Swiss-Prot record, chains A, B, C, D, E, F, G, H, I, J, K:
UniProt xrefs under Pfam families: CLP_protease
Subcellular location: Cytoplasm
Species, as recorded: Staphylococcus aureus (strain NCTC 8325 / PS 47)
Keyword set, alphabetical order: Cytoplasm, Hydrolase, Protease, Serine protease
SUPFAM superfamilies assigned: ClpP/crotonase (SSF52096)
PROSITE patterns in UniProt: CLP_PROTEASE_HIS, CLP_PROTEASE_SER
Keyword Nucleotide-binding listed: no
Active site: S89 (nucleophile), H114
This protein's GO CC annotations: cytoplasm; endopeptidase Clp complex
Gene3D superfamilies referenced in this protein's UniProt entry, alphabetically: 2-enoyl-CoA Hydratase, Chain A, domain 1 (3.90.226.10)
Class in the EC hierarchy, top level: hydrolase
Name of protein: ATP-dependent Clp protease proteolytic subunit
Catalyzed reactions: Hydrolysis of proteins to small peptides in the presence of ATP and magnesium. alpha-casein is the usual test substrate. In the absence of ATP, only oligopeptides shorter than five residues are hydrolyzed (such as succinyl-Leu-Tyr-|-NHMec, and Leu-Tyr-Leu-|-Tyr-Trp, in which cleavage of the -Tyr-|-Leu- and -Tyr-|-Trp bonds also occurs)
UniProt GO molecular function: ATP-dependent peptidase activity; ATPase binding; serine-type endopeptidase activity
Lineage of origin: Bacteria, Bacillati, Bacillota, Bacilli, Bacillales
C-alpha cells in the first residue's frame, strides 16, 4: 500500500531509489523475476555502489532461487544481505550468497537450513530421473554452501538432513552470515 | 448379484464349488485377501485337483499382486490361468504366473505389459529411498517374468519401458501364456 | 428387487433357472464378470440346451465386452441374443455375436453402431501408443462384425464412422440380427 | 420395506404372486430390466391368466420404456394397465400400451403427454445425427400412439408439442385408457 | 464376498473354523477389535492348538496395533504369523510378534520398518506433550522389537530412522521372521 | 464381520454369549445405547455371573459415557473392565468404573486422562450457561474419579489440565486400574 | 449391532420381548414412528403389564415428540420412563410424560429444559403465522409440563427461557421425575 | 480507501507524512515487509524525530513479528507504540516493544498475552525438532518480555500459559505499556 | 464509485474535505482502521471544527468498535453522530458515543441494542476464560452506555438481554441520541 | 510491482527501455502476445541494436512458443537469450532460438529438454488425428533443434524421449547455448 | 503488462498507434467488441492507410467472429492478416478474411480448420431448430471460405469434417493465406 511524497511511489519503489530490495515472501518465479529485474536495474543505474537485499523468506523454488543467486554473482555491485525475521531453506541460501563480509542478520532473526523438497509420479523410470535430478540439485546446493561458509560438503550434507534451526549468532559461527547487526 | 439353486449361493460362490475363482477387477488388498483366502480354502478341500483362475484385470497394487502370486506358487494344486477381456500390468503378471502348460487366453483377450507405477514426495533423501524401492520392485518383476516366459531380462526391460499391448497369439509367442483357447 | 416363491430367489435368479441371462445395463468389468460367470454356470448345468441372452445396453468397455463375447463363442451351448429397447455400441456387437440363425430383436428395439471411444494423455510417444491400440481395436471389432453380418470390412468402417442408428428391420437387413420377433 | 407372512416376501413379491407388477418410479434401464423379467416370469408360470401392471411414473428413458412395451406385446397373457397418481411421458405411453379394453385409471389420477426430450453436443454433423434420431423416435412414438388411441398422427403431433395434462376422463376420451375405475 | 457350503459362511468365517485369521487391511480400531475378538474366540474353542495369522497390511494405528499385540501374547495358544504381500510399519511389528520359531514370510513378500508417524497442533506446551508421547511410543516399540529380533536398541533406532524396505530373506536375517516359506 | 458356527452369530454375538462386551470405538449415543442394552440383557440372563467389558476407546460424549457408567453401577453383576490398546478421556473414566478389584489393563495398553471438551456460541448469557454446565460436568467427573481412584479432587484437577498419558503400571499406581494382566 | 441366541434377534429386539423400549438418539419422524409402533405392539401383546422406556436423547422434533407423548397417554399399560445419560428438550418432556410414580433417572443422568426452537422465512405475514404457531406450541408444552410437574405455568415459562440444566435430584425436586434410582 | 487533497495520497500515506504507521491487521510476511519498509523510509527522512506506531492486531506470525521488532530496535528514532482496540499475542509483544516511556494504550483497548501457537506433522524425529523449535521460540519471547516489562521469566511463563486478557490499566501495571492515554 | 470535479476524488473523499465521515458497513478491523485514520487526519487539519460521522451499520467487532470509540473521545474536535437507516449493536454504541447534545437520527432510522455475541471451543478451562472475557466485555459496554444515556446499569442489562429495536424517538427518550432531525 | 523514477514505469517497463525483455513465467497465449509485442516494439524503436531476452520458464504452449520463435527469427535485430534459473521444454527451445554466438546461461541455470505433451479424447479417428498432429509437431521441433544445436535428428529424438536435465556447461556442449557467462 | 515512454501507453496501445491490432486470445463477445472498436477507430484516424491484424487464436464464438469479419469487410482500409503461432477454427476464418494479396503466416505458424461446434438440449422440436441453425451456420462459413480460398464448397465440406491441421505452406497452397513471411 502506502504512497510516498517526492512523483508518487509505493514504499518499496522509494526504497529502491536508495538501492534497497525487499524480499519478504516465498520464492517463486514471479518473485525471482522481480528481484532479478531490480538487480539489473540497479546495476544499470550505478555499477559501483552496492545493493542492500533484505531477506524475510521461508524459501520456495530452487530454480527461481538460482535465478536470483546467479544474478547476484553476475552483477558488478556488491550485494549486501540482511536477514530479518526468518531466512529458511532457499531463503538462507540467498542469505549466504551476499558479498563476503557483507552478510548480516538482526539479533532475533532466525536461519533454517534443510535439504531440498520435491515430488515424483509415474513410471519407475520417470521416478528414477526425478530422484537423480533432485539429488544432483542437492549436490549443487551443498557444494556452493561449502564454498560460502567454509564447511565441508560432508558436514553440510549431514547438517541439512533434517530441519536445522539456527540463531543469528549460530548462523555467524556456521559461516552463513558475517556479522549480526547490533542496535544502532 | 444372481442367486443359485442347490442352499442359496451367489453366482461366484457356485463357481467356487467347481474350483473356479473369478478375478474381474483391479487388484488391491481387499481383492488379494479374497483371492488368497479362496486359494487356501480350495487347497484345504482338495490338494490334488487343480484350480481355475479367470483373469480380467487392469492390474493394481504390486504387493497385493504378490500376495496372490506367492499363494499360487505355495499351494500344492496347479492353478490354471485364463485371460478373458484384458490382463494388464499386474494382471498380466498373474496370468504368466499360472501352472506351466496351463496358462490360457481367449482369442480376443488383450494382454498389456509395462513397468510399475508409483509416487514419491518429500525430502531428496525420501525420494531416493522411494526411487530405489520401485526400481528394485521392477527388477524383481522382470526377473520372475524372465523365468516364466523364457525371455531375457534385457528384452523384458526393453519391452516394458512403455505400454505394450499384445494379442492372445502374441502373448503365447512371448511366453506369457501357453495356449490360446480355440472355441469348443 | 422382487422375490420369487419356489427357496427364495430374486427375479433374475428365477430366470437363470430357465437358462435366461438379462443384460440390462452398461458394460463394465463388474457386469462382464457376472455375465461370464452365468454363462459358465449354465454350461456346467447342461452343455446341450441353449441359453437366452436379453440385451438392453448402451455399451461400455470394449475389453469387458470381449470377455463376454469370447465366453459366448467358447462354450458349447448356442447363445440366443434378443435385443429389447436398445443395443448400442458394444451392446450391438454382443447382439451380432449370438448363435447364427438365433439373433433377435423386438419390433421397436433400436440398434446403434459406431467406432470405439477412448482417451490419451502425456508424451507424444504415449499418445502414439494409445492411438495405435484403439485403431487396432477398431480393426478387430470390424473384422469380427464383417464375419458375423456378411458385410465387408470397408462398409463396416464407413457405416461406423459416426453414430449409426438402425431400426430392428434395418438391423436384420444389415445382418446384425437374423429375425425380428413378431408378437406371439 | 414391509415383510409378509406366508416364507418371507416383501410387499411387492407377495403382489407378484397374484400377478401384480408395481411401476412406481422413473423408467430407466434398471427398472425396465426388472419389469421385463417380471413379465417373462409370470408368462412362464401361466401364459393364460392376465397380468396387472400398476403405473405411477413421471416417465424416463424412451428405449427402456420400449423394452417394457415390446415385452408387453410379445407375451401371450393380456397386460392390464392401471394408472394411479400420475402417468407422464413414457409412463402414459406404457399406460396406452395395455391390452385393449383393459386400460384403466383411478378417478383422480393424472395423465401427461408430450414430445421426447434429449440432448446433442459436438460437431454440426453430430448434432444433425442426434436431431434426426430424436425426430425419428418421436415419429415411432406418435405412430404407435395412433394405433392405440384411435387419434390421427397429425393430432398427436399437435397435442404433444407442449406439456399436455389430462384428467382420467379426458384420457379415456382421448383413447389412452378404456375406463376410469369407479369406487368398488 | 463369496459364500461356502457346509450352514452358510463367508470365506473368512470358513477359514476361522480352521483357526486362521486374515489381516489384509490397514490397522484401525475396528480391525483391531475384530482380530482381538477372533483371537479370544479361538482360545475359548481350544487353548492348545495354535492360531494362524496372515498379515498383508501397510500398518496404521499404533494403539490399535498394541491391542492385537497384547492379545497375542496374553492368550495360551501359539500365534503363527505369515506375511503375504506386505507387512509395513505396525504390520511388520505384528509379524515380529508371532510365536518364536513360527514367524514366516512368503518368498516375494515385503517387510518395511520405520519410525511412528503423528501430529500435534496448538500451544507450545501442547506440542511438547504430543512430542514426548510419540517419542515414548517409539521407545516402547523399539524395545519390544529389540527383544523379538535380537538386535540392539541402538541399531533398531538407526534402521527405523527412514523407510527401510526388506526382502523376506533380509527380514529373516534381521530377526523379524524365523523362516521364509519355500513352495510346497 | 466374521460368522461363527453353533445357529449363526457374528464374532461379537458369540462373545456376548460368554458375557463379554467389546467397546472398540468412540463413545456416542448409538454406542452407549448398544452397550447399555448388552448390560441389561446379560443381567436378565444371569444376575450373579460377572460381565467382562473390553475397552479400546478414545472417548467421546460425556453424557453417553454416563449412560454406560450408571448402568454398570446399577446392575447386580460385577462388571470387569479390561483396557486393550487405549482408554482415553471418557474411555479411561469407564475403565476406572469397573468393579473394584476387577479393573485391568494389558501390559502395553495406554491410558489417557484430560479435562472435558466442549463448545459455546451466541449471546454472552448463553455462553455463560454453557460454561457453567461444562465446569459443573468436570466437577462431577472429578468427584467420581476421586471416589474410584482414591486421588484427591484437587490432584485430579491438576493432573487433567492437559493431556496426561499413562502407562499400564502408571494407571495402576494412579488407581485407575487394580492390576496389569500378565501373559497367561 | 449384536445378535442374540433364543431365533435370531438384534439386542433391542430381545429387550422388546421384556417390554423394554430404548430411546437413544435424536427425536425425528423415523424414531417417533418406531417408538409409537413399539408401544402399540406391546399393548397388543399385553395391555396390563407396564412398559419400560429408557431415555437418552437431546430431543428433536416437537411434533414427532408429541406422537410419542400422545401414544404413551392413550395406551392402557403404564409407561415407566428411565433417564440415562441425558434427557434434553423434547427428551425431558417425554421423561416427565411417564406414568405418575414411575418416572426415573439414574444418579448421574442429566435433564435439560428450554423453550422450543424454530425458523421462519418470507413475507411479514408468513413470519407472523410461524411466530404465532411456535408461541402456541410453547404454551401447549408449558401447560402439560405444569400438569405433570406440579409447577405453575409462570414458573415453567421463566425456567425454560434459557437452557436450564438440572441434576437427577434437582429433576426430582422440580417434579420432572418421581425418584432417582439408587444402585441395586 | 479515502483519497486526500495536498498530490493524491490515500489516508494512510497522508498519515505516513506525519511519521504515523498504522498496524490494523493480522501480522504476516506481507504486513511485516510493509511495516519494516515504512520504518526504514522514515529513518532515511529524519533519523531524529520519533515515529508513531498504532497497533490494532490479533497477532500472527512470530518471525514476521520479529522482523518488525528488530527493525524497531535497530533504527535511531524512538518508536512510540499506541494500542487501539486490541493488541493480542504478537500484537501485544510489539506494543511492549516501543521506546521506554513511550508505550501507550487508549482507556478501553484490550491487551492479550499467551504462549505461541504452532503445528507439527510427520515422523517422531520431525515432531521432536518442531517441538524443540517452538519451545526455544517461547523462551526467546519470554526473555524479551521479561526485559521490557520488568517481570520475572517464571511469572511471564505462568501468566502466558493460557489466554490472559488485560485491561489498559492492567497492562500498565504489568509493564507492557507505560501510560494509558487520558482523553485530550 | 462516482468521481467528483474539483483534482479527482471519489464521492467519500469530497465529503471528507467537509469533515464528513461515512460509516456505511459492518465494523471490522479494516473499517475501524479507516475511520480512526480519518479522525486523526481531520484533527491534524483543524482541531477546533467538529466532525460529522454518519452511521449506517449492523455493528460488528467489539474491539474494532472500541478503536473508533476511544479515538472519538481522545481527539479534541466534537464528533457529531447521525444515524441513517440502521445503527445496530456496536453501531448503536458508536451512535451513543457522539458528542453530548450532538447525537442525531433521521425520523425513520432504526436503533437496535443487544448483548455482545461470541464463540468458544476447546477445554472447559478455555471455555471458562472465553466466558469471563465476554461477560467482562458486556460490563464495560453497559457501564459506558449507562454514563452516556443516563439509564442505570440494571436497566441497560435488562433491556439488552434480547434484541431490542427502537424508533428514532424511542432512541431519544432512551438517551442514545439527543435529537431526531426534522426535515429541513 | 515496484515503480521507477525517470515518468512512472514498473520495473519491467524501465528494463524494456534498455531493450531487455523478461520471460519469467510459463508460456501461454497471453505471455506470447506480450513478448511478441515487445519484440515488435523494440524493432520499431531501433532495428539495428540487439535485444536481450532473459528466460526463466518451465515451458508451456508449443504454438505460443512458436509465435515467439518466429517473431525472433523475423525481426532484424539479433535476439540474445540468457537463461537464468531454468529453461525447460519450450523454454529451452526459445533459449536455443537466440542469435548464433549470443545464447547464454548463468553458471547454475538449468536446461531441460523432452518431447511435447498433449491429450486426445473421443473417437478412434479423432485420436488418430491428434496423435498424427503431436508427432508432426515433435518432428518440427526436433528438426529446428537439429539446425540450431548441430546435433543429428536421430540424437535429438533419443535425447528427448524422457526428461533430460542439463547443466549450463552440458547445454553449451550440446549446442543449446554458445557460452556460460562467468561472473563479471 | 509493460508501459511505454512517449504519455503512458500499455504495449498494445503503442502498437495501435502504428495501426497494429493484436488478437492473441480466444474469440468471444468482449474480444470482438474490442477488435471492432479498434478497427472503427483506425478508419476514423486514416481511411487510406492499411491495418495490421496479428492472429494467434484457437477461435471461439462464431457470431463474435462474424462481428470482426463484417467490420473488416465494411471499413475502407485494407486489413492485413498475419498468423503467428496458431489460427484455429474461427481464428483461421478471420485469417483468410484479410485483404487479398495481404494475408500472411510466419514459417512455423499453424492453421487449423474444422466444422462449427455447439449444443442443444430440450424437446425434439427445440433440438431440430438448433440443428438447423448450426447446419445453416456451417453453410455460411463454407460458402465464404470457398469465395476467399478458391476451393469448391464440396471440398471445404470434406476438408472441415474433422480437425484439419495445416502448415504455413499448406495454408498458402489451400488459399487461406497469400504468402508465408520469409525472415527479414
Amino acid at each position: 500500500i502506502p504512497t510516498v511524497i517526492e512523483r508518487a511511489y509505493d514504499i518499496y519503489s522509494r526504497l529502491l531509489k536508495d538501492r534497497i530490495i525487499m524480499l519478504g515472501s516465498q520464492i517463486d518465479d514471479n518473485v525471482a523475476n522481480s528481484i532479478v529485474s531490480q538487480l539489473l536495474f540497479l546495476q544499470a543505474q550505478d555499477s559501483e555502489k552496492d545493493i542492500y537485499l533484505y531477506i524475510n523468506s521461508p524459501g520456495g523454488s530452487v530454480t527461481a532461487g538460482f535465478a536470483i543467486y546467479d544474478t547476484i554473482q553476475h552483477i558488478k555491485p556488491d550485494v549486501q544481505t540482511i536477514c530479518i525475521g526468518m531466512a529458511a531453506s532457499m531463503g538462507s541460501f540467498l542469505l549466504a550468497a551476499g558479498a563476503k563480509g557483507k552478510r548480516f542478520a538482526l539479533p532475533n532473526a532466525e536461519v533454517m537450513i534443510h535439504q531440498p523438497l520435491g515430488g515424483a509420479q509415474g513410471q519407475a523410470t520417470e521416478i528414477e530421473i526425478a530422484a537423480n535430478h533432485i539429488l544432483k540439485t542437492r549436490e549443487k546446493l551443498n557444494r556452493i554452501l561449502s564454498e560460502r561458509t567454509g564447511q565441508s560438503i560432508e558436514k553440510i550434507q549431514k547438517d541439512t538432513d533434517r530441519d536445522n534451526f539456527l540463531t543469528a549468532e549460530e548462523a555467524k559461527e556456521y559461516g552463513l552470515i558475517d556479522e549480526v547487526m547490533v542496535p544502532e
